[PDB]
From Swiss-Prot:
The chain holds residues 172 to 831 of 852 of the full protein. This is Lysine-specific histone demethylase 1A. It is linked to Cleft palate, psychomotor retardation, and distinctive facial features: A syndrome characterized by cleft palate, developmental delay, psychomotor retardation, and facial dysmorphic features including a prominent forehead, slightly arched eyebrows, elongated palpebral fissures, a wide nasal bridge, thin lips, and widely spaced teeth. Cleft palate is a congenital fissure of the soft and/or hard palate, due to faulty fusion. Residues 257-335 form a coiled coil. The lineage of its organism: Eukaryota, Metazoa, Chordata, Craniata, Vertebrata. The SWIRM domain may act as an anchor site for a histone tail. It comes from Homo sapiens (Human). Belongs to the flavin monoamine oxidase family. One of its GO terms (cellular component) is DNA repair complex. There is a cross-link at residue 271 (Glycyl lysine isopeptide (Lys-Gly) (interchain with G-Cter in SUMO2)). Its cofactor is FAD. GO terms for biological process: cellular response to cAMP; cellular response to gamma radiation; cellular response to UV; cerebral cortex development; DNA repair-dependent chromatin remodeling; epigenetic regulation of gene expression; guanine metabolic process; muscle cell development.
């Protein structure tokens, strides 16, 4: 399944047209189904050609010469399919050699705000489509939230660092195009408690199994018993979790109660049984006395005998039904149900898994929408997640080649009228001087964190619509930070990619909870997640580094941990050009706000467009999602301005 593999790798069903294709090829969708079969094959075959060699441009001509008969005969259809794929960035995207050099005459002028992956991806597209495009970047570097520290042989990422599984991922293509070195993340992640001692394989697996059950339970509560609203306020994932933990504690307590009752019932039956046995002894003594007096005794002894014995066929008979209790009893007081749901240490290890989830969503669990936090799960790529061994910055740096990028240029105002656009920016090195860039269309790739900023960092004239600003306000924008520790010696386990540090309280579970071993040089990355991420931004590098060394010394022993030669600490929330790490579906929002974010603002025809990780519903908060959003908008614009 080569052509089949291609559809897959492009995130398309290999045997049916998508709604997009139906819209663009209405004559094929509503027409002979035999012609649809041909369409799909032409489409899957062109994707294959491009994906097999993403380093070179795939022209309309070269596609025609490589299709086999009878397909290479339908010149018009092939062209219609090739243009559609190219326009929408499914082929000829990223960085590749042009065999058809760009035309000197550039049609339409577009200003892209932001030189991060979404902006660079869109930039290159628009440029290859023959448009005039300039990017205005506030930082003194490209990449935005993809940031790599490089000094000597030290390489460490302060922004994105993980690639999520190649099958279906457009980064698979970019990876080959920029020669980026990827390494699969080894699953083994040892956990150490606050005292520095490892958590036993047993408990590790047990708590992780509870973590999974607890989550599955919230999913059931949400998508089945529709428990998504309480007191008119939407329910958060954190909220649902604590409720499910409570029910578990209640159940444990209930089985504890029932058991104690079995003990007490058995204990009463015994006490009562002992008491009548004592009375039967007192009844037997009444006989092993009296019994012995006269001459009729040959009948009086027989009598007192078959009498005194019958009271033993009674007594030791009770000692029997007595042994069946002491047995039942000792068996119960030896097999008690669980005393608690989670011990105090167990709850700490569980909190580690929760911090892990707060890392992934870049936000405290109490802020996540119980119903839509994992709204995009259905679009995951297949395969192992990888790590970028040579620094993820190699991507935006390569995507920047040949583009007109203006660094240290912070946009402060965006005016869009029914007949053109003006973007006002200021040099960040001399806020004295401003710049005024005229253009036909503005592509805003500003982070949702900047768009939420109050007072506003950039102004919109006219102001953006209420349906757009309301969406910006509902959506969540998280935070996540890393501490890069650069040493001259490796004192950790070189075979382990990651290891965890379990925190002492629920509140600080996200403080330096996960360490990463990813690079050539002796470097360790420590994560700060959930509630701890924003707070820690207020502590200086030195103090924060200190706390890392302490954790580290508690695990490998002091004297094993030397002082770092170099350290880098991110503070994404404080970063004016970001205002956080990435979006998350907040409670009260949903995947529809990601769609609304993508909507262009048009006063008589579309003028203001949007891209960036917060504008792609099926791939939010990711580097690839940022890439696709870029390709998406370059398409939407070329359609408006070039047709
Ligand atoms: C900050 C951050 C972000 C991410 C991560 C860690 C951290 C600490 N990574 C993760 O830890 C994992 C995430 C993850 C998520 C999902 C699955 C698996 C993992 C991570 C991860 N994503 C991913 O796929 N794998 C990852 O490994 N993210 C998120 C991505 O970094 C992010 O979604 C993506 O880079 C966003 O790109 P955009 O183009 O949408 O935004 P940005 O790069 O910020 O571009 C905006 C530009 O605008 C510029 N700018 C601003 N204000 C102005 C102005 N006024 N004028 C002119 N220019 C301006 C600003 O400086 C930027 O250059």
């Amino acid at each position: 399944s080569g052509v089949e593999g291609a559809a897959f790798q492009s995130r398309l069903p290999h045997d049916r047209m998508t709604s997009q294709e139906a819209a663009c090829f209405p004559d094929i969708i509503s027409g002979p189904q035999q012609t649809q079969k041909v369409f799909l094959f032409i489409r899957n075959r062109t994707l294959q050609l491009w994906l097999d060699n993403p380093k070179i441009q795939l022209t309309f001509e070269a596609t025609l010469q490589q299709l086999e008969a009878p397909y290479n005969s339908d010149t018009v259809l092939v062209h219609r399919v090739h243009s559609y794929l190219e326009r929408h960035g499914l082929i000829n995207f990223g960085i590749y050699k042009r065999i058809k050099p760009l035309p000197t005459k550039k049609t339409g002028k577009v200003i892209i705000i932001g030189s991060g992956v979404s902006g660079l991806a869109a930039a290159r597209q628009l440029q290859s489509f023959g448009m005039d495009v300039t990017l205005l970047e506030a930082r003194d570097r490209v990449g935005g939230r993809v940031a790599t520290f490089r000094k000597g042989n030290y390489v460490a990422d302060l922004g994105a660092m993980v690639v999520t599984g190649l099958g279906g991922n457009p980064m698979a293509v970019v990876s080959k195009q920029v020669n980026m070195e990827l390494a699969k993340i080894k699953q083994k992640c040892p956990l150490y408690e606050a005292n520095g001692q490892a958590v036993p394989k047993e408990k590790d697996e047990m708590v992780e199994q509870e973590f999974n059950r607890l989550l599955e339970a919230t999913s059931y509560l949400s998508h089945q018993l529709d428990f998504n609203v309480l007191n008119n306020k939407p329910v958060s994932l954190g909220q649902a979790l604590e409720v499910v933990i409570q029910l578990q504690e209640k159940h444990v307590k209930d089985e504890q109660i029932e058991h104690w009752k079995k003990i007490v019932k058995t204990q009463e039956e015994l006490k009562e049984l002992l008491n009548k046995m004592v009375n039967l002894k007192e009844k037997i003594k009444e006989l092993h006395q009296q019994y012995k007096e006269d001459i009729t005794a040959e009948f009086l002894v027989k009598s007192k005998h078959r009498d005194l014995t019958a009271l033993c066929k009674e007594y030791d008979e009770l000692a029997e039904t007595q042994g069946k209790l002491e047995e039942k009893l000792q068996e119960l007081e030896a097999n008690p149900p669980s005393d608690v749901y989670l011990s105090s240490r167990d709850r700490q290890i569980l909190d580690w898994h929760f911090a892990n989830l707060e890392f992934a969503n870049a936000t405290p669990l109490s802020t996540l929408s119980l119903k839509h936090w994992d709204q995009d799960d259905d679009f995951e790529f297949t395969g192992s997640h990888l790590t970028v061994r040579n620094g993820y910055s190699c991507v935006p740096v390569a995507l920047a080649e040949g583009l007109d990028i203006k660094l240290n240029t912070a946009v402060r105002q965006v005016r869009y009228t029914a007949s053109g656009c003006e973007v006002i920016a200021v040099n960040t090195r001399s806020t004295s001087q401003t710049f005024i860039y005229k253009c036909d269309a503005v592509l805003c790739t500003l982070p949702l964190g900047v768009l939420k900023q109050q007072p506003p960092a950039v102004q919109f004239v006219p102001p953006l619509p209420e349906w757009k600003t309301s969406a910006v306000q509902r959506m969540g924008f998280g935070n996540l930070n890393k501490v890069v520790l650069c040493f001259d010696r490796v004192f950790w386990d070189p075979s382990v990619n990651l290891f965890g540090h379990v925190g002492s309280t629920t509140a600080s579970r996200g403080e330096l909870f996960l360490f990463w071993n990813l690079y050539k040089a002796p470097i360790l990355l420590a994560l700060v997640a959930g509630e701890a991420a924003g707070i820690m931004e207020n502590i200086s590098d030195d103090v924060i580094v200190g706390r890392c060394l302490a954790i580290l010394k508690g695990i490998f022993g002091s004297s094993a941990v030397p002082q770092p030669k170099e350290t880098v600490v991110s503070r994404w929330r404080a970063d004016p050009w970001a205002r956080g790490s990435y979006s998350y579906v907040a409670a009260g929002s949903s995947g529809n706000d990601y769609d609304l974010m993508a909507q262009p603002i048009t006063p008589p025809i579309p003028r203001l467009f949007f891209a960036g990780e917060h504008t792609i519903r099926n791939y939010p908060a990711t580097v690839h999602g940022a890439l696709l959003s870029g390709l998406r908008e370059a398409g939407r614009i070329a359609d408006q301005f070039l047709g």
